[PDB]
Amino acid sequence: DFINWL
């Protein structure tokens, strides 16, 4: 699982 916040 991951968080990708741009």
Q: How many CA atoms lie within 13 A of 4 on its CB side?
A: 1
Which amino acid is present at 2? F
**Tokens standing for residue 6:** 């741009």
The DSSP result for the chain, as a single string, is ------
PDB resolution in Å: 1.5
| Dihedrals phi, psi of 2, to nearest 5 degrees | -155, 165
| Residues contacting residue 1 through CB under 8 Å, at least 6 positions apart | none
